[PDB]
Design a binder for these strands. Structure first.
Ligand code: MG
Ligand code: MG
Ligand code: MG
Ligand code: MG
Ligand code: MG
Ligand code: MG
Ligand code: MG
Ligand code: MG
Ligand code: MG
Ligand code: MG
Ligand code: MG
Ligand code: MG
Ligand code: MG
Ligand code: MG
Ligand code: MG
Ligand code: MG
Ligand code: MG
Ligand code: MG
Ligand code: MG
Ligand code: MG
Ligand code: MG
Ligand code: MG
Ligand code: MG
Ligand code: MG
Ligand code: MG
Ligand code: MG
Ligand code: MG
Ligand code: MG
Ligand code: MG
Ligand code: MG
Ligand code: MG
Ligand code: MG
Ligand code: MG
Ligand code: MG
Ligand code: MG
Ligand code: MG
Lengths: 101, 119, 272, 72, 88
RNA sequence: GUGGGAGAGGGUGGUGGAAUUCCCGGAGUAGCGGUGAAAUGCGCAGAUACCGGGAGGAACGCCGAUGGCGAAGGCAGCCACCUGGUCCACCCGUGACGCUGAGGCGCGAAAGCGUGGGGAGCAAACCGGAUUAGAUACCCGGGUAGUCCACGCCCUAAACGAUGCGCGCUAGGUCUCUGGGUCUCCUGGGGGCCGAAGCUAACGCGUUAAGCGCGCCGCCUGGGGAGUACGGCCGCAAGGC
């Protein structure tokens, strides 16, 4: 088991009950691959440096999990089956690195 | 079809010629000119002077459709570059800022042998 | 794949046999079998309408399921992967939880013991049939219907597949195994995956007789006939074509495009 | 040429953290390129970590790949 | 990758006495451990030639060890072999 | 062993943006391209320039370095999985378990080869336009293998630091990468410049030796003939030893 941070970007135009729609499937999957959530930050709408998918904005989620390392790749494969999931970025959790310190 | 006050002005500036297309705000060309439309053929099209006439003539056709202002986007290194910008500023056409939109591959297609050179 | 042979005869040096290790069915087939009337290339008049056919092994026809939209929602275990003599591909046996058995044409990667299902539901997974409209753009798929409810038509040959390139209204754009680009209706079923047994195309027949087993009788060049018989028939030795190359019925056989111009299907085609 | 050192300007910060634009936004040029070590004032080891982070950041859409050049 | 306990396991098991950290017998086993792992990694990734280079060094280190041991105590050599499943 | 590091080190799977090309839609007109200057070419069948959509392949801008890793060939977007080497600190374990290495085995840029695939940009061959006495070239317009992937071959190279590997010994100065410390300083493993002694035909090298020594391997013995012939071994061939 290992600590990853799962960044996921969603269609902005989704209404809130649809956002929760896409967000459940996310969560069964997480629970299905064995991802045990720890933190979470749902930062919602955000403004993009470039369009993802013809869209100046995208709806952000970030999870932090402990899941068996070998199932992470399929996790993200499955997470990404979209259509409304426009990004998945799954990173290994790291001990922060500080400047001016 | 339509006549517009505000607009946009494009400079394609290459070594062999300089060409200026002026658009509507939405980007569709109103009218255009180049080193050749001025009446040059050949290498003299690449020159800085002909680029001047080019841009003046571009604007003169646009101002006849009632162009007033433009946003002037330039692309590419060439001796036609600045004299084209210069020519637009004091021509007619209050020019609102300026940009360099010149295309720069993030290391794309292998270039022609002519531009490969040092590796 | 692809069994080779030491040259202990000529033609054993070049012969190449399919790999059967994917196959779990030994000989017998499930009595979804039915008998095949071999034509000899002859039509209902006794007349050969397709030349150089006939001979070749007796075959039982395995009846196979080209509409998956009966069993919508009912899943099935993949029971066996079997050999079917009527197609390049392999059939997979399905035991439905219904208790019903069907043959599916067996996709690449599909394992014995998998669960399969078909319907607007269903995961996007190898074996699963869905209306095309619900298959995510980009997934490669086989066994497509051309019009809805009419049965799978496209990408059924071993190793073939198709790709979903886009949506437009009630249609999706597919790239067919031909490379043609075709609008198909969204409602049409398709089943995700490539067909597989894709090593099929590398078999080397190897000797004359092996073509004879597949019911292909010897094929004779127009060049070798007389002119009664063929546009190339004639003239002393050998001899070149002497004219633009022709079929026996006399139409041109290099380049002449034969698809009917005004076909209604042309509104829905975009390519080669 | 004088300007600033651009590391100087802000306090302790995590150069590992790829989600905060307003820190990282300051390390990009007027056209959006990762700023050379000289005017970031970072270390050797530190500039790599910064960079790699910035790369990630752009993939997530938070940081640009390129802006244009204005008012020449 | 072989985890701390996973090797500790192997350390404890092959240790010639309480707290043996790397005597000859522990080393061979410890090697044999990561050898066998790599050897399976290559089975899959056959194109990874750089890692195969290491395997060679591993295999070789373990061999020199085992030869020393077979010269000094030929008995606890033959017994280390069959425990680990090696020369036959 | 234990605890810690840095890294374009290798394999597999994913994934992002810029650009090029082609297509579709739009707007829009008389040229564009290209060069020393042109011409071929492209363009009123609507080109170039401009914007919107789409398809597809390749390579990863800034960071980036006089940088890092690898035995070498080599290795550069980002993500994960598997995985090699390596260094530091602690001073815990084994007790010389070492060096080197004919054969053997494995790896080995590019090009090349086989079977599939893939093909945007590039581009041997080839065509055309210029140039020239000629131009089977140099410049320009086209352009097929190839470049890309998988599997399997080929085994070469200015494969270079033209500098075999291990060890001990012989001033310093300065820059830099990366560990550890009583973090100005000291200490360890790399990467560069200048240099003591010494070496060297000189040029130069010089704690990263080409110095002073020991071990063991490879190689040299005038130039051409020739890395050719013959033979042998290997390769599908080219061809290699
Ligand atoms: Mg010109
Ligand atoms: Mg009859
Ligand atoms: Mg018979
Ligand atoms: Mg024949
Ligand atoms: Mg005859
Ligand atoms: Mg007759
Ligand atoms: Mg006739
Ligand atoms: Mg004839
Ligand atoms: Mg006769
Ligand atoms: Mg004759
Ligand atoms: Mg004849
Ligand atoms: Mg066709
Ligand atoms: Mg690494
Ligand atoms: Mg690593
Ligand atoms: Mg058009
Ligand atoms: Mg490692
Ligand atoms: Mg001790
Ligand atoms: Mg002792
Ligand atoms: Mg090679
Ligand atoms: Mg190659
Ligand atoms: Mg050839
Ligand atoms: Mg090839
Ligand atoms: Mg080919
Ligand atoms: Mg092509
Ligand atoms: Mg010529
Ligand atoms: Mg001539
Ligand atoms: Mg050329
Ligand atoms: Mg070309
Ligand atoms: Mg050799
Ligand atoms: Mg040599
Ligand atoms: Mg040093
Ligand atoms: Mg001296
Ligand atoms: Mg002689
Ligand atoms: Mg030779
Ligand atoms: Mg010979
Ligand atoms: Mg040699």
């Amino acid at each position: 088991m290992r600590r990853y941070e799962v960044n996921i970007v969603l269609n902005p135009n989704l209404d809130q009950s649809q956002l929760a729609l896409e967000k459940e499937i996310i969560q069964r999957a997480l629970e299905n691959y064995g991802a045990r959530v720890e933190k979470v930050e749902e930062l919602g709408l955000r403004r993009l440096a470039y369009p993802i998918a013809k869209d100046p904005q995208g709806y952000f989620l970030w999870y932090q999990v402990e899941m068996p390392e070998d199932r992470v790749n399929d996790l993200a494969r499955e997470l990404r089956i979209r259509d409304n999931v426009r990004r998945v970025m799954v990173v290994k959790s790291q001990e922060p690195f500080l400047a001016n310190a | 079809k339509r006549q517009v006050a505000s607009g946009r002005a494009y400079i394609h500036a290459s070594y062999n010629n300089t060409i200026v297309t002026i658009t509507d705000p939405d980007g569709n060309p109103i009218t255009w000119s180049s080193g050749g439309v001025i009446g040059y053929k050949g290498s003299r099209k690449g020159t800085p002077y002909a680029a001047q006439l080019a841009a003046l003539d571009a604007a003169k056709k646009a101002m006849a459709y009632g162009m007033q202002s433009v946003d002037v986007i330039v692309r590419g290194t060439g001796a036609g570059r600045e004299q084209a910008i210069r020519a637009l500023q004091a021509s007619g056409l209050q020019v609102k800022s300026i940009v360099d939109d010149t295309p720069v591959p993030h290391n794309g297609c292998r270039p022609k042998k002519k531009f490969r050179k040092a590796s | 794949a692809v069994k080779k042979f030491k040259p202990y005869t000529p033609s054993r040096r070049f012969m190449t046999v399919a790999d059967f290790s994917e196959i779990t069915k030994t000989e017998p087939e499930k009595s979804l079998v039915k008998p095949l009337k071999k034509t000899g290339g002859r039509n209902n008049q006794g007349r050969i309408t397709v030349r150089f056919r006939g001979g070749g092994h007796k075959r039982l026809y395995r009846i196979i399921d080209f509409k998956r939209w009966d069993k919508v929602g009912i899943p099935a275990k993949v029971a066996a992967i079997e050999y079917d003599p009527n197609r390049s591909a392999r059939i997979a046996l399905l035991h439905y939880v219904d208790g019903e058995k069907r043959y599916i044409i067996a996709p690449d990667g599909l394992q014995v013991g998998q669960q399969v299902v078909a319907g607007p539901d269903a995961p996007i997974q190898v074996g699963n049939a869905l209306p095309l409209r619900f298959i995510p753009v980009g997934t490669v798929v086989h066994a497509v219907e051309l019009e809805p409810k009419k049965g799978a038509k496209l990408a059924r040959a071993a190793g073939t597949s198709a790709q979903i390139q886009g949506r437009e209204g009630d249609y999706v754009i597919l790239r067919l195994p031909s490379g043609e680009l075709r609008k198909v209706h969204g409602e049409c079923y398709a089943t995700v995956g490539a067909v597989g047994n894709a090593d099929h195309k590398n078999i080397v027949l190897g000797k004359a007789g092996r073509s004879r087993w597949l019911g292909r009788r010897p094929h004779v060049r127009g060049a070798a006939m007389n002119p009664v018989d063929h546009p190339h028939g004639g003239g002393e030795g050998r001899a070149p074509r002497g004219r633009p190359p022709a079929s026996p019925w006399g139409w041109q056989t290099k380049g002449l495009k034969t698809r009917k111009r005004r076909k209604p299907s042309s509104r829905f085609i975009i390519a080669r | 040429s004088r300007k600033a050192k651009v590391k100087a300007t802000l306090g302790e910060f995590d150069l590992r953290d790829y989600r905060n634009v307003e820190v990282l936004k300051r390390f990009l040029s007027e056209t959006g390129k990762i700023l050379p070590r000289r005017r970031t004032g970072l270390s050797a080891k530190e500039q790599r970590i910064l960079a790699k982070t910035i790369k990630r950041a752009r993939i997530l859409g938070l940081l640009p790949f390129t802006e244009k050049l204005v008012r020449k | 990758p072989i985890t701390k306990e996973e090797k500790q396991k192997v350390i404890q098991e092959f240790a010639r006495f309480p707290g043996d950290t790397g005597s000859t017998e522990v080393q061979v086993a410890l090697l044999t451990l990561r050898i066998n792992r790599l050897s399976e990694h290559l089975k899959v990734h056959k194109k990874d030639h750089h890692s195969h280079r290491g395997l060679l060094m591993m295999v070789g280190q373990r061999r020199r060890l085992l030869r020393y041991l077979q010269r000094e105590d030929p008995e606890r050599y033959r017994a280390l072999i069959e425990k680990l499943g090696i020369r036959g």
